[PDB]
Amino acid sequence: MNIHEWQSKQLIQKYGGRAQSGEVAFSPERSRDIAKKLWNQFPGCEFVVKAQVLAGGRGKGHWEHGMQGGVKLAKTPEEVYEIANEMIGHKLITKQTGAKGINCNKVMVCGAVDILKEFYLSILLDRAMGCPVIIATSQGGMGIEEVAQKCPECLFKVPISVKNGPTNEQLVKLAKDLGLEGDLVQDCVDNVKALYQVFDKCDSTMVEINPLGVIETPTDEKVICCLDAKIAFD
Amino acid sequence: MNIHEWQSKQLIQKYGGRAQSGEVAFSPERSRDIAKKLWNQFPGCEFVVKAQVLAGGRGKGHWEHGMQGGVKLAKTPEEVYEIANEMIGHKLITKQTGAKGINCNKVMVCGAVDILKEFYLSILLDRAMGCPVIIATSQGGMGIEEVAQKCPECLFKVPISVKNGPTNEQLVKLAKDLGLEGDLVQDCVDNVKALYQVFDKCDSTMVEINPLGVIETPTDEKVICCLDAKIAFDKDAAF
């Protein structure tokens, strides 16, 4: 059992992680209202509409009626209406779904942000090791399968003490191994700490953040932020 | 009679202008909640808390009990609570108010944005000329009075046909006179068109935008945006 993106992100926020939960809408009219209200706070901003379905590969998927993409850029609230209207009540087809696609009943409306770096981060129980493991790569753009066979220096695997959880030294090293400097190191530490707490305290089978991003705020500060989230349970 | 910033900005938006209306809160608890919810959309953004009072010079004002500023930057939702708690139910003292200040009953919570340029733009009925006039300077940071005597080249005054309203050629020239190029020229034209419609169709005696800004969106697009707004009306006007 997997939970939806927005639910996973809200759970991450509850444990102190930074994640763009946006706001969910169950109608295209409501989606447009969310975007219009957000223009009162950041005039001229763009939007991203994210189909909330239990499946990956949304961005490169397609809809029966012709729309391309399950994660779509929109420049206006009316474009948010148009995009959400093709998602809600319709089926999205991705490589992780059969040709049957999967039904979508709601979308996430997000502000469009500048993404500087994309990381992959997952937390799971590694049966071989017999302990929790934090897996991460500094090349979140490309799949994790390929990364381990086209640039293994960028993939990192961190065994975790089950009883003591991650140590500060482990997380600091992981942040620097991913290429982070300055304030971003401790920012990353805090976020991975929160991601592990979600994993441990929620009895999760997997916490996968793809991508864990370095984004710019509207005033150009660099911060760590979960831009996607998949949390699984048995 | 002047109306509050929140109302002026929403009125400008109704007529197609770009203005940061933010969201109004009547308690510090609500102010915090607005900021926290906004972090779901632009994580890590900063905030600006703006006292809604009928007086200018808020940014440079002070509160009796020690806080400095009526327009204040806040880095977190809890700082928004702290700042708003010192505004709501308290009196702000500015250059335009008396010594005792003026009561503040609500604040605007706004997202912090990068401001590239600040312009002054006003639309009013010039009695001497006997027609509406659009006044603007490319130096909105300094007072319009300072501009007229230390850089008059930056102040522009455009008489408007009362019957036909501003022409596209006047507005294009004004945008270029203010130093704009590229997409910002037409962006400025559209926004000033909207401001004049507010002035004309709402029977206003003054629409003052100080500053009319060039701001960056979160994805670094440059757009025109009203960052302050003062609209006046005359209850005892000539019929």
Ligand SMILES: Nc1ncnc2c1ncn2[C@@H]1O[C@H](COP(=O)(O)OP(=O)(O)O)[C@@H](O)[C@H]1O
């Ligand atoms: N708010 C956003 N602004 C800009 N780009 C975004 C935003 N959120 C996500 N993206 C981009 O969209 C891509 C697809 O989104 P994602 O949530 O990962 O869905 P999926 O992995 O199912 O395709 C991300 O890899 C990221 O590059």
Ligand SMILES: Nc1ncnc2c1ncn2[C@@H]1O[C@H](COP(=O)(O)OP(=O)(O)O)[C@@H](O)[C@H]1O
């Ligand atoms: N959202 C914002 N982000 C950053 N700075 C802002 C924002 N809105 C306004 N400002 C700045 O705050 C200053 C003071 O606010 P303003 O609305 O002009 O009030 P007042 O003129 O009464 O001081 C503005 O001139 C502008 O420089």
Ligand SMILES: [Mg+2]
């Ligand atoms: Mg993803």
Ligand SMILES: [Mg+2]
């Ligand atoms: Mg002002």
Ligand SMILES: [N+]
């Ligand atoms: N940015």
Ligand SMILES: [N+]
């Ligand atoms: N910016």
